[PDB]
Amino acid sequence: VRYCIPGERLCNLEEGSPGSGTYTRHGYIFSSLAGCLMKSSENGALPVVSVVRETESQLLPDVGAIVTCKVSSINSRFAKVHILYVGSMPLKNSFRGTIRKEDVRATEKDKVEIYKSFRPGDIVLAKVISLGDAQSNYLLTTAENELGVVVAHSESGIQMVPISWCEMQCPKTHTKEFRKVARV
Amino acid sequence: MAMEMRLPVARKPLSERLGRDTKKHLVVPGDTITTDTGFMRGHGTYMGEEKLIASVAGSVERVNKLICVKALKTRYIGEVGDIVVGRITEVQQKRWKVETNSRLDSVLLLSSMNLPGGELRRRSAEDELAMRGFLQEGDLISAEVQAVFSDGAVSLHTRSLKYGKLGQGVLVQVSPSLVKRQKTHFHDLPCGASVILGNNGFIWIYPTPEHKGGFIANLEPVSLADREVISRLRNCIISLVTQRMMLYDTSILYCYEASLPHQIKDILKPEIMEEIVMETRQRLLEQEG
Amino acid sequence: ALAARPSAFASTLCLRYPRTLDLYKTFLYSRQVEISPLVAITPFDFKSASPDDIVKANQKKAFTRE
Amino acid sequence: QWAIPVDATSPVGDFYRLIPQPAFQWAFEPDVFQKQAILHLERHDSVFVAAHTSAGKTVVAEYAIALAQKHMTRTIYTSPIKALSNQKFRDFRNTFGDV
């Protein structure tokens, strides 16, 4: 196996096609990273050559991506969050987000009271939809059956458990509270 | 190539080159305008104690009960059904922000826009994601004012076929008081180019669209015979706008023909403008008179 | 264009810092220091209604509006 | 020509063989002219109707009204009298949706 530097001759446009993290010019394929030389043969020949470091310390979000978050504060019409994980991998820093009162459920419906959906301190799984404005920057959504709060936390510091699609209950004091439970 | 470096010349005051006396009524701030029994204040004046006091330099213009003062230098003020030209400076969640040389910014609502497709298919929140993609930062449009807000703001719409994103050409910005009110601000001058006389002071010059909204890019080279016409109109517009001239179709046509004898590159001198503006002045005098 | 061998300052700047009986005795941890849950169903297996899916399939199938 | 008067019996040979998917069902039975208009209305056609009963002509009207929410568009109903203007609103309020 061989590694890369962010420029070198790799292949012709006839001997393969550019993949992820690469660029081409003057009929040649040029590297743009310092990762590893991967040639996805796939099926149909002409492998899509690409270079991947495979050790992602940081990664910029996209138009569509799954992210693990952490609520900071909640408002009657939005809920500021902090992006913590990009899908699976840990993130070295923390970005910001905002869930408007249209992205909670998968119907973009009326009602949907924000107060009992995303209580602060929880950890949720959500998907971005846009690159946002300067007020709200990433505009995340949870309009799916698989998205919502996944690992909640009790009033007094006890791991919480899902109890229904909308209700969760404390194991110690048997107290009933409202969340937006995502499928496991 | 000689790199002429001339020296400043003293200005001749009083406009003695022609000689005229004004019959109007001129005022300065603090002057007491007519103070008869009952009158209504206009724009440019205010009221003190039983007095109509002018608040800006200009000339009084009255239509049968109304004392007002018309200043000679202002910024654009919006009116319903007015052709304007502007540039996008902010792209928001549900609107754009357009700069049109006004006291505030102008809002182009997403509800009023000929979206790509140009027909009845649908309008929903799926378009909102890509709305901020085509009308990006720093583009040029040409729309019409819709209504007046409660704080002097203007909302402008693009609900026609002649309005929308513009293409190639040059832009010339002047004061919004040298454009003559008319009923056709779109022109197709028989020279090789066109023009849009924005009521806000934005003049847009583009070539004729060959035969026959921003859907077409047409980012292909423009013929040599078209640039020389655009440059000629650009310089002639600068020449008429500089001294006094109010801009409209006949003045530009008259000056363009008068500019043929000598080259387009050499018309930047203080005197060549005078010898062209005066010739257009006398052509207007021998035609209107 | 010959590359060279390091010297003290560089070879000390590039240091990687990555049971075996007992030492430093006083600093061990032992020397220095009912729950009846009645838990509910542990997860909620979503085997049931999931309203968004309800309202969508409901209206699409229904398709009557009367 | 721009004007085609469809014969009262000639066009219709079948109604449910076409339009495989359902529509705004009626408790009672639909007449020949209502199905004649429904067949054309599906193709986004222009329809003129000249009949005698009042509510009989409203079947195609509420067919179009129910068809708009499947297209997410909007429709306008014009009633040049105040009493009838709100009766249709009351009829369609409890019936479905928002008016």
XYZ file of C-alpha atoms in Angstrom:
638
model
C 0.000 0.000 0.000
C 1.085 3.599 -0.624
C 0.057 6.976 0.775
C -0.524 10.368 -0.822
C 0.429 14.055 -0.768
C -2.079 16.683 -1.941
C -0.885 16.503 -5.502
C 0.542 13.782 -7.779
C -0.270 11.944 -10.984
C -2.530 8.965 -10.262
C -4.473 7.873 -13.364
C -5.807 9.014 -16.715
C -9.446 9.935 -17.271
C -9.681 6.702 -19.273
C -7.881 4.630 -16.606
C -10.423 5.363 -13.869
C -12.547 8.217 -12.587
C -12.106 10.735 -9.756
C -13.690 9.885 -6.432
C -13.861 11.592 -3.038
C -11.302 14.230 -2.103
C -9.660 14.410 -5.534
C -9.458 16.755 -8.509
C -8.460 16.401 -12.152
C -6.810 18.656 -14.721
C -5.285 18.264 -18.199
C -6.466 14.677 -18.540
C -4.757 13.453 -15.354
C -6.052 12.627 -11.877
C -4.391 14.615 -9.094
C -4.414 13.901 -5.371
C -5.776 16.439 -2.894
C -5.122 14.772 0.483
C -2.462 12.893 2.453
C -4.505 9.764 3.153
C -4.482 6.268 1.656
C -4.777 5.114 -1.956
C -8.156 3.367 -2.272
C -9.509 2.048 -5.584
C -13.152 0.960 -5.288
C -13.438 -1.598 -8.085
C -17.217 -1.879 -7.449
C -18.779 -3.578 -10.523
C -18.353 -2.567 -14.142
C -14.564 -1.991 -14.145
C -12.955 1.477 -14.280
C -12.552 1.823 -10.492
C -13.481 5.136 -8.878
C -10.103 6.038 -7.378
C -10.102 8.125 -4.199
C -7.893 8.954 -1.215
C -9.138 8.812 2.385
C -7.148 9.489 5.555
C -9.625 7.314 7.541
C -8.745 9.209 10.762
C -11.284 12.037 10.824
C -10.446 14.501 13.590
C -12.983 17.086 12.351
C -15.530 17.070 9.539
C -17.749 19.850 8.231
C -21.495 19.101 8.122
C -23.337 18.839 4.817
C -26.835 19.424 3.447
C -27.874 15.950 4.573
C -26.065 14.276 7.464
C -26.843 12.448 10.703
C -25.492 14.186 13.814
C -25.617 13.533 17.560
C -26.354 16.669 19.568
C -26.893 18.127 23.048
C -29.566 20.679 23.920
C -28.342 23.915 25.518
C -31.564 25.908 25.934
C -35.175 25.752 24.773
C -37.610 28.448 23.638
C -41.301 28.514 22.733
C -40.453 28.542 19.005
C -36.915 27.117 18.701
C -34.312 25.142 20.646
C -30.598 25.894 20.410
C -28.366 22.807 20.394
C -24.661 21.951 20.168
C -23.429 19.529 17.508
C -21.333 16.914 19.297
C -20.870 13.885 16.989
C -20.947 13.772 13.179
C -22.868 10.506 12.787
C -20.585 8.194 14.762
C -17.206 9.855 15.276
C -16.395 12.282 18.107
C -16.001 15.959 17.236
C -13.037 17.983 18.493
C -15.080 21.206 18.765
C -18.773 22.081 19.045
C -20.933 23.847 16.473
C -24.408 25.333 17.006
C -27.854 24.535 15.659
C -31.529 25.428 15.842
C -34.682 23.305 15.576
C -37.602 25.492 14.544
C -41.135 24.586 15.503
C -41.704 22.868 12.160
C -39.064 20.081 12.206
C -40.114 18.186 15.351
C -42.512 15.656 13.811
C -42.554 14.121 10.333
C -45.712 16.016 9.305
C -44.719 19.698 9.765
C -47.985 20.092 11.657
C -49.588 22.633 13.980
C -49.655 22.153 17.803
C -46.334 20.346 18.561
C -45.498 22.214 21.764
C -41.722 22.672 21.901
C -41.606 22.833 25.711
C -42.330 19.142 26.171
C -40.232 17.867 23.295
C -36.525 18.662 23.741
C -35.943 19.481 27.432
C -32.406 20.860 27.904
C -29.594 18.512 28.857
C -30.718 15.625 26.660
C -28.869 14.036 23.743
C -30.724 13.752 20.433
C -30.179 12.324 16.959
C -31.106 14.694 14.136
C -30.389 15.476 10.489
C -29.365 18.780 8.925
C -31.245 20.192 5.938
C -29.395 23.410 5.121
C -26.371 25.630 5.717
C -28.554 28.222 7.480
C -28.465 31.992 7.984
C -26.305 34.041 10.353
C -28.948 33.817 13.109
C -29.584 30.066 12.878
C -26.606 28.371 11.273
C -27.404 24.695 10.565
C -31.217 24.300 10.783
C -31.414 20.692 11.947
C -34.520 18.511 11.641
C -35.968 15.525 13.498
C -38.860 14.846 11.079
C -38.442 11.074 11.068
C -39.302 7.988 13.085
C -35.606 7.302 13.726
C -34.789 10.846 14.903
C -35.487 12.408 18.285
C -34.143 12.222 21.815
C -32.323 8.914 22.330
C -30.618 9.078 25.751
C -32.460 11.346 28.194
C -31.601 12.169 31.814
C -33.658 12.283 34.988
C -34.493 15.271 37.167
C -31.969 14.132 39.808
C -29.218 12.460 37.773
C -30.474 8.983 36.873
C -30.306 7.343 33.452
C -33.763 7.570 31.912
C -35.680 4.975 29.834
C -38.155 5.161 26.915
C -41.703 4.238 27.901
C -43.807 5.138 24.842
C -43.805 7.224 21.663
C -44.427 10.392 23.702
C -44.105 9.563 27.415
C -41.166 8.449 29.515
C -41.213 7.375 33.176
C -38.702 7.566 36.010
C -37.574 4.219 37.477
C -37.011 5.489 41.019
C -39.975 7.763 41.817
C -42.219 6.616 38.923
C -42.728 10.122 37.531
C -44.246 10.801 34.106
C -42.721 13.299 31.668
C -42.973 14.102 27.960
C -40.255 13.703 25.317
C -39.972 12.837 21.608
C -38.710 9.255 21.662
C -36.808 7.977 18.623
C -36.792 4.331 17.587
C -33.812 2.313 18.809
C 1.213 57.028 -25.441
C 2.193 60.287 -23.741
C 0.476 60.264 -20.302
C -0.926 63.792 -20.358
C -0.807 65.389 -16.886
C -2.648 68.709 -17.096
C -3.148 71.404 -14.449
C -6.324 72.593 -12.705
C -8.170 75.540 -14.238
C -10.241 78.026 -12.256
C -14.000 77.571 -12.548
C -16.082 80.365 -14.057
C -19.061 81.129 -11.776
C -22.557 82.591 -12.358
C -23.103 80.378 -15.461
C -22.398 83.438 -17.610
C -21.871 81.330 -20.748
C -25.562 81.605 -21.672
C -27.190 84.069 -19.254
C -30.637 83.574 -17.720
C -32.761 85.060 -14.937
C -35.083 82.828 -12.907
C -38.711 83.820 -12.361
C -39.253 81.252 -9.590
C -39.422 81.697 -5.814
C -36.313 80.480 -3.988
C -35.954 79.886 -0.248
C -33.402 78.682 2.293
C -33.994 76.984 5.660
C -35.389 79.427 8.200
C -37.174 81.565 5.604
C -40.841 82.300 6.303
C -43.055 81.158 3.412
C -46.514 82.689 2.807
C -48.529 82.653 6.045
C -52.101 83.200 4.859
C -55.266 82.005 6.619
C -55.289 78.336 5.655
C -52.582 76.295 3.944
C -51.297 72.720 4.017
C -47.647 71.813 4.534
C -45.814 69.698 1.972
C -42.539 67.799 2.002
C -39.573 70.061 2.699
C -41.337 72.457 5.095
C -42.538 72.532 8.691
C -44.612 74.778 10.951
C -43.635 76.942 13.929
C -45.876 79.647 15.393
C -48.498 80.707 12.806
C -45.748 80.382 10.192
C -44.881 78.133 7.258
C -41.093 77.808 7.553
C -39.022 76.248 4.782
C -36.701 73.475 5.955
C -34.647 72.711 2.818
C -33.116 74.689 -0.031
C -35.109 74.670 -3.255
C -38.096 76.237 -4.984
C -41.678 76.372 -3.730
C -44.273 74.523 -5.822
C -47.976 74.953 -5.036
C -50.961 73.148 -6.536
C -53.957 75.239 -5.365
C -53.727 74.893 -1.572
C -50.311 73.307 -1.014
C -47.031 75.000 -0.119
C -44.063 72.637 -0.486
C -40.349 72.978 -1.244
C -38.624 70.788 -3.844
C -34.991 70.171 -2.937
C -32.370 69.691 -5.647
C -30.524 66.775 -3.996
C -32.304 63.877 -2.273
C -32.430 60.087 -2.179
C -35.005 57.915 -3.907
C -38.495 57.754 -2.398
C -40.726 54.835 -3.300
C -44.072 55.102 -5.051
C -46.571 52.490 -6.196
C -45.997 51.262 -9.740
C -42.456 52.588 -10.189
C -39.706 50.890 -12.188
C -36.584 50.370 -10.065
C -33.254 48.568 -10.383
C -31.422 47.118 -7.403
C -28.853 44.627 -6.162
C -29.216 41.793 -3.653
C -27.246 42.450 -0.462
C -28.729 39.882 1.960
C -30.443 36.531 1.395
C -32.724 35.656 4.311
C -34.891 32.654 5.192
C -38.047 33.993 3.511
C -36.895 37.146 1.697
C -34.058 38.994 0.005
C -32.699 42.449 0.799
C -32.095 44.856 -2.081
C -30.181 48.149 -2.070
C -31.776 50.841 -4.246
C -30.274 54.118 -2.947
C -33.069 54.681 -0.434
C -33.165 55.585 3.247
C -33.631 51.883 4.086
C -33.412 48.470 2.435
C -36.023 47.039 0.084
C -37.557 43.595 0.562
C -38.253 41.148 -2.270
C -40.656 38.551 -0.896
C -40.386 34.942 -2.037
C -44.152 34.957 -2.634
C -43.593 37.424 -5.511
C -41.008 35.866 -7.831
C -41.128 34.078 -11.201
C -39.459 30.889 -10.026
C -37.746 28.586 -12.546
C -40.284 26.652 -14.584
C -42.385 29.703 -15.368
C -45.797 28.057 -14.992
C -48.252 26.507 -12.530
C -46.710 23.380 -11.024
C -46.557 23.930 -7.233
C -45.294 26.282 -4.527
C -44.323 24.830 -1.142
C -41.460 24.680 1.358
C -39.319 22.483 -0.917
C -38.504 25.567 -3.002
C -37.284 27.443 0.091
C -34.071 25.395 0.253
C -33.024 26.308 -3.306
C -34.451 29.850 -3.269
C -31.171 31.071 -1.732
C -29.214 29.385 -4.537
C -30.097 31.193 -7.761
C -30.724 34.722 -6.428
C -27.389 34.743 -4.636
C -25.437 37.648 -3.152
C -24.629 40.553 -5.449
C -26.972 39.858 -8.369
C -28.935 42.396 -10.407
C -32.714 42.418 -10.841
C -35.232 44.893 -12.263
C -38.598 44.887 -10.485
C -41.573 47.145 -9.724
C -42.597 48.581 -6.360
C -45.673 46.913 -4.844
C -46.615 48.862 -1.705
C -45.367 51.274 0.961
C -44.698 50.015 4.488
C -45.269 51.941 7.733
C -41.645 53.107 8.163
C -40.759 54.206 4.633
C -39.774 50.717 3.501
C -40.698 49.502 0.019
C -41.756 46.027 -1.111
C -41.068 45.236 -4.768
C -42.450 42.436 -6.940
C -41.431 40.650 -10.145
C -44.820 39.484 -11.453
C -44.343 40.027 -15.186
C -42.284 38.830 -18.158
C -40.001 41.855 -18.631
C -38.863 41.745 -14.985
C -36.371 39.406 -13.371
C -32.662 38.748 -13.099
C -30.566 40.646 -15.641
C -27.593 39.450 -17.649
C -24.511 41.015 -19.213
C -23.933 44.733 -19.605
C -22.703 47.777 -17.708
C -24.261 49.786 -14.880
C -24.119 53.557 -14.338
C -25.351 55.118 -11.085
C -26.406 58.781 -11.015
C -28.444 61.007 -8.718
C -32.183 60.117 -8.678
C -33.297 63.539 -9.897
C -32.040 63.631 -13.518
C -34.532 61.059 -14.865
C -37.647 62.435 -16.561
C -40.968 60.847 -15.648
C -42.627 59.074 -18.575
C -44.853 56.097 -19.356
C -42.257 53.844 -21.061
C -38.998 53.422 -19.134
C -37.960 50.472 -21.336
C -36.192 51.421 -24.562
C -34.799 49.642 -27.627
C -32.726 52.478 -29.160
C -31.891 51.904 -32.867
C -28.127 51.877 -32.310
C -27.238 48.274 -31.417
C -28.021 48.235 -27.702
C -30.868 48.821 -25.252
C -31.270 50.660 -21.940
C -33.368 50.630 -18.765
C -33.972 54.022 -17.134
C -34.422 53.108 -13.485
C -36.382 55.744 -11.573
C -33.963 55.303 -8.640
C -30.900 56.409 -10.623
C -29.677 53.015 -11.865
C -29.066 52.948 -15.624
C -28.583 49.488 -17.131
C -27.189 49.104 -20.656
C -27.284 45.748 -22.435
C -27.214 44.583 -26.064
C -30.395 43.817 -27.959
C -31.580 40.237 -27.217
C -31.136 39.123 -30.853
C -34.539 37.747 -31.904
C -37.837 37.478 -29.992
C -35.988 36.057 -16.334
C -32.467 34.768 -15.788
C -33.262 31.260 -17.044
C -30.831 31.742 -19.947
C -27.163 32.280 -19.101
C -25.858 33.197 -22.587
C -22.318 33.506 -21.199
C -20.786 33.597 -24.697
C -18.556 36.317 -26.194
C -20.276 39.482 -27.427
C -19.360 40.815 -30.865
C -16.925 43.706 -31.235
C -19.483 45.975 -32.924
C -21.659 45.836 -29.785
C -19.057 46.903 -27.233
C -18.223 50.098 -29.096
C -21.917 51.045 -28.975
C -22.138 50.296 -25.263
C -19.000 52.333 -24.548
C -20.323 55.216 -26.654
C -23.621 55.234 -24.775
C -21.769 54.967 -21.446
C -19.618 58.001 -22.200
C -22.487 60.017 -23.667
C -24.632 59.279 -20.611
C -21.798 60.437 -18.355
C -21.440 63.604 -20.437
C -25.110 64.604 -20.330
C -25.534 63.639 -16.683
C -22.530 65.690 -15.591
C -23.429 69.263 -16.425
C -27.238 69.370 -15.953
C -28.909 67.137 -18.494
C -32.052 65.200 -17.660
C -31.857 61.728 -19.197
C -34.427 60.269 -21.614
C -34.631 58.725 -25.072
C -34.233 61.766 -27.314
C -31.348 63.412 -25.464
C -29.257 60.228 -25.549
C -30.118 59.610 -29.205
C -29.198 63.206 -30.096
C -25.875 63.080 -28.247
C -24.937 59.667 -29.646
C -25.179 60.919 -33.232
C -23.189 64.048 -32.326
C -20.365 61.855 -30.960
C -19.540 60.010 -34.199
C -16.913 62.399 -35.692
C -14.160 61.639 -33.149
C -13.058 58.613 -31.203
C -14.621 56.982 -28.148
C -11.307 56.887 -26.240
C -10.572 60.605 -26.515
C -13.849 61.878 -25.003
C -12.868 62.424 -21.400
C -11.764 66.087 -21.616
C -13.537 68.978 -19.837
C -14.097 70.806 -23.163
C -15.248 67.933 -25.380
C -18.207 67.446 -23.060
C -19.046 71.121 -23.344
C -18.851 71.098 -27.150
C -21.157 68.047 -27.240
C -23.675 69.127 -24.586
C -24.037 72.566 -26.210
C -24.596 70.981 -29.634
C -27.291 68.730 -28.168
C -28.721 71.802 -26.417
C -29.053 73.679 -29.681
C -30.456 70.644 -31.497
C -33.163 70.472 -28.822
C -33.648 74.225 -29.218
C -34.058 74.038 -33.003
C -36.344 70.991 -32.739
C -38.622 71.853 -29.807
C -38.554 75.526 -30.807
C 19.377 18.169 -1.675
C 20.486 15.916 1.184
C 18.359 15.550 4.311
C 20.110 15.450 7.664
C 20.127 13.800 11.137
C 18.458 15.474 14.132
C 20.024 17.102 17.189
C 19.254 17.134 20.909
C 16.586 19.850 20.934
C 14.564 18.224 18.158
C 14.969 14.664 19.429
C 13.637 15.771 22.818
C 10.841 17.898 21.358
C 9.528 14.850 19.457
C 8.739 12.552 22.375
C 5.719 10.242 22.272
C 4.321 9.719 25.770
C 2.398 6.391 25.563
C 0.192 -4.093 37.345
C 3.852 -4.717 38.211
C 3.543 -4.839 42.002
C 2.886 -1.899 44.309
C 4.731 1.306 45.200
C 3.707 4.776 46.378
C 1.759 3.081 49.132
C -0.201 5.804 50.941
C -1.700 6.633 47.511
C -3.844 3.587 47.050
C -7.621 3.913 46.952
C -8.858 1.580 49.699
C -6.702 3.419 52.256
C -7.814 6.922 51.223
C -11.606 6.562 50.967
C -31.791 -1.060 49.252
C -32.762 -0.684 45.581
C -36.010 -2.407 44.665
C -36.691 -0.949 41.189
C -39.928 -2.575 40.038
C -38.893 -1.550 36.524
C -41.553 -1.039 33.851
C -41.285 -2.662 30.418
C -37.636 -1.962 29.665
C -37.859 -0.505 26.116
C -40.979 0.457 24.176
C -40.601 -1.678 21.041
C -42.689 0.696 18.851
C -44.822 -2.382 17.970
C -47.717 0.149 18.202
C -49.252 3.155 16.643
C -46.518 5.724 15.863
C -49.015 8.503 14.834
C -47.038 10.234 12.020
C -47.115 6.911 10.125
C -50.802 6.642 11.097
C -51.919 9.998 9.756
C -49.950 9.569 6.537
C -51.155 6.082 5.595
C -54.615 6.976 6.982
C -55.151 9.907 4.648
C -53.439 8.348 1.623
C -55.554 5.174 1.816
C -58.745 7.002 2.860
C -58.504 9.376 -0.088
C -62.202 10.220 0.234
C -62.436 13.682 1.852
C -66.189 13.637 2.573
C -62.695 25.670 -33.245
C -62.269 26.021 -29.452
C -65.848 24.822 -28.776
C -66.936 21.174 -28.719
C -70.458 20.274 -27.507
C -70.197 16.696 -26.265
C -73.242 14.598 -27.118
C -75.481 13.506 -24.258
C -74.957 9.783 -24.910
C -72.090 9.315 -27.365
C -68.885 9.738 -25.266
C -69.625 7.751 -22.116
C -69.207 4.010 -22.529
C -67.633 3.256 -19.156
C -66.806 5.207 -16.008
C -64.915 2.981 -13.550
C -62.810 1.087 -16.107
C -60.882 4.339 -16.513
C -59.677 6.341 -13.506
C -58.293 3.204 -11.789
C -57.768 5.039 -8.509
C -60.758 6.318 -6.505
C -62.199 9.819 -6.196
C -64.615 11.874 -4.093
C -67.232 9.199 -3.454
C -70.926 10.073 -3.228
C -73.471 8.278 -1.061
C -76.005 8.345 -3.912
C -75.424 7.432 -7.577
C -73.755 9.774 -10.091
C -75.670 10.770 -13.202
C -74.382 10.491 -16.767
C -73.551 14.197 -17.103
C -71.676 14.316 -13.788
C -69.476 11.441 -14.942
C -69.182 13.131 -18.340
C -67.737 16.223 -16.691
C -65.569 14.216 -14.279
C -63.938 12.394 -17.206
C -62.905 15.696 -18.802
C -62.019 17.437 -15.525
C -59.367 14.796 -14.803
C -57.393 15.962 -17.868
C -57.326 19.551 -16.506
C -59.925 20.547 -19.103
C -62.322 23.494 -19.234
C -65.951 22.582 -18.553
C -69.227 24.377 -19.252
C -72.437 23.068 -17.678
C -76.069 23.925 -18.490
C -78.549 22.053 -16.279
C -81.582 22.743 -14.085
C -81.011 21.263 -10.624
C -78.809 23.362 -8.359
C -76.846 20.866 -6.265
C -76.496 18.551 -9.266
C -73.995 20.963 -10.799
C -72.094 21.228 -7.496
C -70.868 17.616 -7.709
C -68.161 18.512 -10.224
C -67.435 21.650 -8.182
C -66.610 19.645 -5.076
C -64.810 17.117 -7.264
C -62.438 19.919 -8.278
C -62.288 21.151 -4.675
C -61.278 17.713 -3.390
C -58.845 17.334 -6.307
C -56.984 20.527 -5.337
C -55.800 19.185 -1.950
C -54.255 16.250 -3.797
C -52.384 18.859 -5.868
C -51.749 21.258 -2.922
C -53.094 24.156 -5.015
C -55.856 26.665 -4.201
C -59.342 27.170 -5.636
C -61.709 30.150 -5.693
C -65.502 29.869 -5.456
C -67.516 32.912 -6.557
C -71.124 33.383 -5.415
C -72.782 36.668 -6.519
C -75.239 36.672 -3.599
C -74.612 36.859 0.132
C -76.939 34.061 1.268
C -75.449 31.464 -1.081
C -71.888 32.689 -0.457
C -71.813 31.328 3.107
C -74.023 28.258 2.615
C -71.367 26.507 0.511
C -68.765 27.462 3.127
C -70.920 25.906 5.856
C -71.527 22.830 3.695
C -67.819 22.273 3.108
C -66.613 23.269 6.592
C -67.828 20.221 8.521
C -67.486 18.135 5.354
C -63.692 18.493 5.110
C -60.622 20.670 5.526
C -60.575 24.435 5.967
C -62.596 26.945 3.938
